[PDB]
Amino acid sequence: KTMKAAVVRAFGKPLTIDEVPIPQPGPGQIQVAIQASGVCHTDLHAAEGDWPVKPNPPFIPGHEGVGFVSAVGSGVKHVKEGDRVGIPWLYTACGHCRHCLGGWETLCEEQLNTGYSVNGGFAEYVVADPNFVGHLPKNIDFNEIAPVLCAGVTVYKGLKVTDTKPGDWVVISGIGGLGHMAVQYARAMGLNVAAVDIDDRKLDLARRLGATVTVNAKTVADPAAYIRKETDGGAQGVLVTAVSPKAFEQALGMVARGGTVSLNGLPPGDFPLSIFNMVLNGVTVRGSIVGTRLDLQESLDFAADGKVKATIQTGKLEDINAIFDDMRGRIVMDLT
Amino acid sequence: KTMKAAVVRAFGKPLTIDEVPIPQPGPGQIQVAIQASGVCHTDLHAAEGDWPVKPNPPFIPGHEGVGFVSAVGSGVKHVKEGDRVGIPWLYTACGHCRHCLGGWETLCEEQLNTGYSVNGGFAEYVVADPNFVGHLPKNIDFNEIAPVLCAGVTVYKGLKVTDTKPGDWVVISGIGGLGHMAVQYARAMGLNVAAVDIDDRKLDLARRLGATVTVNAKTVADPAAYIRKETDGGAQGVLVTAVSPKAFEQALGMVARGGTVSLNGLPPGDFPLSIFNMVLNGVTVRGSIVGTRLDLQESLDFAADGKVKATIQTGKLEDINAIFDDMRGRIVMDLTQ
Amino acid sequence: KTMKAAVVRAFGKPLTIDEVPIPQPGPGQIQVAIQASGVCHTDLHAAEGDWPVKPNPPFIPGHEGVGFVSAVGSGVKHVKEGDRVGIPWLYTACGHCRHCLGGWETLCEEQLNTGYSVNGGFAEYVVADPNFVGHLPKNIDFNEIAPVLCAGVTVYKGLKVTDTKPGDWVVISGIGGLGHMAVQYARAMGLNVAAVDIDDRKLDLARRLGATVTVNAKTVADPAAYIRKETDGGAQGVLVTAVSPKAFEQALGMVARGGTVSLNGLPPGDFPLSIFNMVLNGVTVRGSIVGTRLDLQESLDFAADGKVKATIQTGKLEDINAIFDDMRQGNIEGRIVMDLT
Amino acid sequence: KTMKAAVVRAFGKPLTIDEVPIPQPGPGQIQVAIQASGVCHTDLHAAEGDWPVKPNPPFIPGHEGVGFVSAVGSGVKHVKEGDRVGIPWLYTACGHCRHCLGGWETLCEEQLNTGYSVNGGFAEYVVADPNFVGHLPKNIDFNEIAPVLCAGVTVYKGLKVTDTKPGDWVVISGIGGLGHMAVQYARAMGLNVAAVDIDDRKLDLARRLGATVTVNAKTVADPAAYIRKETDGGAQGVLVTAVSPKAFEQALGMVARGGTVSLNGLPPGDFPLSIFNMVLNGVTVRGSIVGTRLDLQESLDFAADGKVKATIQTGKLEDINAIFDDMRGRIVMDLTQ
Numbered sequence A: 001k002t003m004k005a006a007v008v009r010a011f012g013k014p015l016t017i018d019e020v021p022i023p024q025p026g027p028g029q030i031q032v033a034i035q036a037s038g039v040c041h042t043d044l045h046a047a048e049g050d051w052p053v054k055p056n057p058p059f060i061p062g063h064e065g066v067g068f069v070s071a072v073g074s075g076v077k078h079v080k081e082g083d084r085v086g087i088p089w090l091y092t093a094c095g096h097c098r099h100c101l102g103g104w105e106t107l108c109e110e111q112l113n114t115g116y117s118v119n120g121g122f123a124e125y126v127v128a129d130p131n132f133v134g135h136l137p138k139n140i141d142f143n144e145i146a147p148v149l150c151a152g153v154t155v156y157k158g159l160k161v162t163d164t165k166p167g168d169w170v171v172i173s174g175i176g177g178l179g180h181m182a183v184q185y186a187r188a189m190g191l192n193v194a195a196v197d198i199d200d201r202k203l204d205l206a207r208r209l210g211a212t213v214t215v216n217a218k219t220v221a222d223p224a225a226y227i228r229k230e231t232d233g234g235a236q237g238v239l240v241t242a243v244s245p246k247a248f249e250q251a252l253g254m255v256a257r258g259g260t261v262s263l264n265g266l267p268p269g270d271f272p273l274s275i276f277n278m279v280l281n282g283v284t285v286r287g288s289i290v291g292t293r294l295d296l297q298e299s300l301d302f303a304a305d306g307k308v309k310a311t312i313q314t315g316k317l318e319d320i321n322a323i324f325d326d327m328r329g330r331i332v333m334d335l336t
Numbered sequence B, D: 001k002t003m004k005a006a007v008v009r010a011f012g013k014p015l016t017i018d019e020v021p022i023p024q025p026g027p028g029q030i031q032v033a034i035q036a037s038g039v040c041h042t043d044l045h046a047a048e049g050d051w052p053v054k055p056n057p058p059f060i061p062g063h064e065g066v067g068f069v070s071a072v073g074s075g076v077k078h079v080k081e082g083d084r085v086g087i088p089w090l091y092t093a094c095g096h097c098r099h100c101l102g103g104w105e106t107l108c109e110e111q112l113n114t115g116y117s118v119n120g121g122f123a124e125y126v127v128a129d130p131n132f133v134g135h136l137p138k139n140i141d142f143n144e145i146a147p148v149l150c151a152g153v154t155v156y157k158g159l160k161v162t163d164t165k166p167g168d169w170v171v172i173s174g175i176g177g178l179g180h181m182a183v184q185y186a187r188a189m190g191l192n193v194a195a196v197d198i199d200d201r202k203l204d205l206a207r208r209l210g211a212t213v214t215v216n217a218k219t220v221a222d223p224a225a226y227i228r229k230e231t232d233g234g235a236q237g238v239l240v241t242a243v244s245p246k247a248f249e250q251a252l253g254m255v256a257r258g259g260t261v262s263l264n265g266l267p268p269g270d271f272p273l274s275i276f277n278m279v280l281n282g283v284t285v286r287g288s289i290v291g292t293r294l295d296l297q298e299s300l301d302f303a304a305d306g307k308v309k310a311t312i313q314t315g316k317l318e319d320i321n322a323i324f325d326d327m328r329g330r331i332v333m334d335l336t337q
Numbered sequence C: 001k002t003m004k005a006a007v008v009r010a011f012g013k014p015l016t017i018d019e020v021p022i023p024q025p026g027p028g029q030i031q032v033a034i035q036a037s038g039v040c041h042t043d044l045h046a047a048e049g050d051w052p053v054k055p056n057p058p059f060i061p062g063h064e065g066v067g068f069v070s071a072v073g074s075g076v077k078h079v080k081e082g083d084r085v086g087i088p089w090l091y092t093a094c095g096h097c098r099h100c101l102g103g104w105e106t107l108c109e110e111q112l113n114t115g116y117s118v119n120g121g122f123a124e125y126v127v128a129d130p131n132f133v134g135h136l137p138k139n140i141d142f143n144e145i146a147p148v149l150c151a152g153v154t155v156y157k158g159l160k161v162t163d164t165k166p167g168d169w170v171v172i173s174g175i176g177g178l179g180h181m182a183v184q185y186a187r188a189m190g191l192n193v194a195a196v197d198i199d200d201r202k203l204d205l206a207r208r209l210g211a212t213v214t215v216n217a218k219t220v221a222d223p224a225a226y227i228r229k230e231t232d233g234g235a236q237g238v239l240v241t242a243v244s245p246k247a248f249e250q251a252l253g254m255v256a257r258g259g260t261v262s263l264n265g266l267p268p269g270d271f272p273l274s275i276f277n278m279v280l281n282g283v284t285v286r287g288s289i290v291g292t293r294l295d296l297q298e299s300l301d302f303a304a305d306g307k308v309k310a311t312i313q314t315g316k317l318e319d320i321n322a323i324f325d326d327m328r329q330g331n332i333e334g335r336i337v338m339d340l341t
């Protein structure tokens, strides 16, 4: 009784694909047989040991694992065998702090994070807290639902915290794995959608997915001015999904007075902010990643109802190191 | 036929106290006999020509002018001679844009600004738009009410946009002209208040005005860490009233996850922002200066009801250059000299 | 010298079509040559004297009058002859009270109301306050746009104050002039829509406009119980646009715990409220009145962009009494708009 | 082996003080040694079997029990023996529905209610779910903190859902067990407070607690008009703590346009609501009872900081039937004396 897993033995060094023991579920735990497993840029930073707070090698990355509940520990009510579930970034949270009690468990200072501070989905099996798994709709293929668990909920919640309403303009900055999803959520939320990127093929994709205003930030000299023109003075919201220094600076020129910039990236270093302009223009800048368990259910319901579909590129657990190179739509590893 | 006025005739040069004609109110305008006139850092930036959009010299600064209506122009309703009014930063706004129609006239792209793009209250008389003046409470002396027109409304609105509630912790960063008023608004809004400054005197003022936690940012090893400990993981709101590089950095370390930093200053240059930390911690950073006509009325009511009282240093119109040097509580010129 | 106008002379009696003087704009006013004029059930309530505060006959009803600016009074800025405008219920407001300053001018105690406390658009010309007219999208026909000036703006704002979010369920109660517009706004706002009425043709209209759940409250004893079943325990929002108090009473049973029932309809009298159920279930009931000038602009942009479209049949000013019979008897599909061209 | 408990053996019959087994904590549970136990009108309605969904007799009422954790079942992290805790109305909730996941566990369709659907605190021990107990501030006596668990949290959350802000006027209708606490929470929330009741003595108490505007609804012919005059046009919020036909009708007359009436009682029957008035005035009427776990913690912190203090009258478990007669400020049975 062993399983295949991609394991980070040491930071920076390529992951070894080893045969390890099948983790078993204690009380209050469950076991999931992973059918598909999405790859996020966060998994990259996990393997690099790049961030202030680091994993402890050896560990299995991955927080877009989806499959079937294969075993159920004692005490576990509700989640039964065969249940279709996903194991997202938020592995568990304390349940008693003011963040947890107020519907903001994503902020819990004692959370554990799947594929980071505990073993994740880059593997055939994973043990998880059933109180925090995502319940997946039956009508959506595993390869296709996997990205909702991080990219999808991230951009959905990101849009909610723009504080916009139907009829408003929202700018999606970056039409990659996160952004192509965000265009679809934004349309389903009744927003008029503008898209910004450096690649005309991605803007073409945004248009097909419902963006009605597009601008190429490399070939147009002043993309912020272009967006202000097309939105009568700027967008009420901007979601920045790929936070390069240029994208951030331009995002701040695209937002209308009183508007909100919502940031989803986890880039390194400091970025320059004109406090003068933020204050004069009454602008809000706000960070958001992932979402609460309720945000994730809501985000899954949009996929279930056909409003949101991820463009995916499929792969195998063995492609993990090449995948990470290609990174340096969404990649999902099919474990079938 | 003429009045005394402090005029900026050239950027960066001394203001002259000049005898200039008394502006007369046309249709839809009123005239105000100024009794007191507050001085703001914005006036200094107006006189220096520091900012990207500049005044057009010669002009009279001042957007904290308070006094009595002295003449009423054709067609003006309700306002009469003797009414107590102030002429704040927002001189007028278009009344038809989405910002104006939504009750956010402070954002109007066509606004004029008192003592910046039109003449202001550093003079014995001002012509104003009666739809935009502040209506002052009769029980508060002019010298004392003047600072509510810019400092008070700024920190009051700044606090409203921290998105906090009674019982939450808020930090007031900087206990100067703005900050000492912010302490009082914050306590009146049911907040628990922490104060941060670099001067123990200002911190003791904060305490007497209601702050139950104080920290000296220069004499403590890690002021942010100390604030987080005293507020059980950080403040739900942080109001930054004096925006130095260090105060901004420390402010971001003081906010709880999911919290909001409200910025009230107009410092030059760019400040470093860790997006990684903003995103991981779910933090909001928001700019807010002055406020709408309704924000100002609400701010004035707190003064009317004794909940907020400005500490003022009085001066004379003639002192205005000396006053600008001192700046390089609140300064208020008393025109009943 | 004169124009044609439909005038209420006495409550409950037929309106007469009379030649009256053309109103002339004074300072700060405009005149509008009316091209189309929506018939709102408020005009009927005003013609019947249904409400505790009544108009003062003789008056011209109509607050869904749309057309071209035909003259401009002294001092008026921006508006010019030929501009496409509508004169809605909120004719004017004071501009200085706390409601007006804080984005809630629809609550202003000094407002005047078009076709009620001032003469309205059941006439060839209206004199208006240009500060409060709707500015109409040029790509939409007058007959089609007219209902947005009240039916549209009202249900748009009514939906905003349900405090719902995309993906939530909303129930529209009463699929008439307001209600058929409400189904469409709700769908454009990202809501799933249930519809309730007392006539299967109105439920069919709802379904064609995007409702995916329907129930007939005249044939089904407990419509609320069917709604709850079809929405997993109730809708997060309910908009009552109906003209019967019993609708209001039954709406309270359609909302999920923590949900909000938004009230637009204005039948006379009271409905019984179970305070017990409201408190146990954490329910909100909220009255919603037309919309602010900003709400109106937003609501017009939906019609401009093709996201909503009023279902209309045109009539003539002379037919107003037959139109009121039709309205009273529930034989209007959507809205009747009088065409004055 | 056994314990004292007041047991409802049959609806509408006197409670029998019986000798019953001590409940034992299974896994995921704790046992609490009750020191004080507040009585609420809800306990009377439970005993009487008045409501559509009823208890299943025999049962022990009481959802304001406070005391010391006396044993801890297996699996229970965090909560320990000797911990100071209360067992409020919300005994448990499912933790997986949209209400529970959204921070609105008070609305959970699968909740159990202490002293109603499970045995409660009218006894020396109670078995509780540690995830849902209230953690009491160490500085407040048991008799004094008990009412916060229902009365206090009820009016606090009630006030939060008036959607008001500091400086607004709120009216507290009914100054009894709930309302005298409500006056104190409202003042601590920065509200200007008006009070309505039929008894000059309760209005005098409301004044001592911070209400500046008072009216006797029995001796003043038109109390709503009085309140409208005194609040310059109506209150932005009204909290109705005792919901009679007359108090409801008057509350709706006291609210400004766009204001909010928050209802805290569970009265029988139907109440007339004018549709025309609700719509033209843009009024909100909303129901609220008790609160979430977070709401309760917040309400407890106000008690801990001395901003809210319940007036209590003490009694004994054996008095319960006499207490209910008296019923048909807050009564708290002291189980130590």
Ligand SMILES: NC(=O)C1=CN([C@@H]2O[C@H](COP(=O)(O)OP(=O)(O)OC[C@H]3O[C@@H](n4cnc5c(N)ncnc54)[C@H](O)[C@@H]3O)[C@@H](O)[C@H]2O)C=CC1
Pocket (backbone or CB within 6 Å): C039, C040, C041, C042, C043, C045, C150, C151, C154, C173, C174, C175, C176, C177, C178, C179, C196, C197, C198, C199, C202, C217, C241, C242, C243, C244, C246, C247, C263, C264, C265, C266, C267, C288, C289, C290, C291, C327, C330, C332, C334, D279
């Ligand atoms: N609050 C506000 O701002 C506004 C309110 N109104 C009011 O809204 C109401 C509706 O106006 P319109 O749409 O023009 O009327 P309409 O006559 O076009 O539609 C009324 C609809 O209510 C339905 N209905 C009647 N009894 C019902 C019941 N028991 N259950 C469900 N549906 C029922 C009818 O079948 C009809 O479909 C009127 O009272 C009117 O005065 C109108 C405009 C604005």
Ligand SMILES: [Cl-]
Pocket (backbone or CB within 6 Å): A205, A208, A209
């Ligand atoms: Cl495509």
Ligand SMILES: [Cl-]
Pocket (backbone or CB within 6 Å): A187, A188, A189, A190, C187, C188, C189, C190
């Ligand atoms: Cl949609």
Ligand code: NA
Pocket (backbone or CB within 6 Å): A118, A119, A120, A126, A127, A128
């Ligand atoms: Na695991």
Ligand SMILES: [Zn+2]
Pocket (backbone or CB within 6 Å): A093, A094, A095, A096, A097, A098, A099, A100, A105, A108, A109, A110
């Ligand atoms: Zn936690």
Ligand SMILES: [Zn+2]
Pocket (backbone or CB within 6 Å): A040, A041, A042, A043, A063, A089, A150, A151
């Ligand atoms: Zn991720």
Ligand SMILES: [Zn+2]
Pocket (backbone or CB within 6 Å): B093, B094, B095, B096, B097, B098, B099, B100, B105, B108, B109, B110
């Ligand atoms: Zn404007």
Ligand SMILES: [Zn+2]
Pocket (backbone or CB within 6 Å): B040, B041, B042, B043, B063, B089, B150, B151
């Ligand atoms: Zn200023």
Ligand SMILES: [Zn+2]
Pocket (backbone or CB within 6 Å): C093, C094, C095, C096, C097, C098, C099, C100, C105, C108, C109, C110
């Ligand atoms: Zn007004």
Ligand SMILES: [Zn+2]
Pocket (backbone or CB within 6 Å): C040, C041, C042, C043, C063, C089, C150, C151
């Ligand atoms: Zn109407």
Ligand SMILES: [Zn+2]
Pocket (backbone or CB within 6 Å): D093, D094, D095, D096, D097, D098, D099, D100, D105, D108, D109, D110
């Ligand atoms: Zn639940």
Ligand SMILES: [Zn+2]
Pocket (backbone or CB within 6 Å): D040, D041, D042, D043, D063, D089, D150, D151
């Ligand atoms: Zn109770």
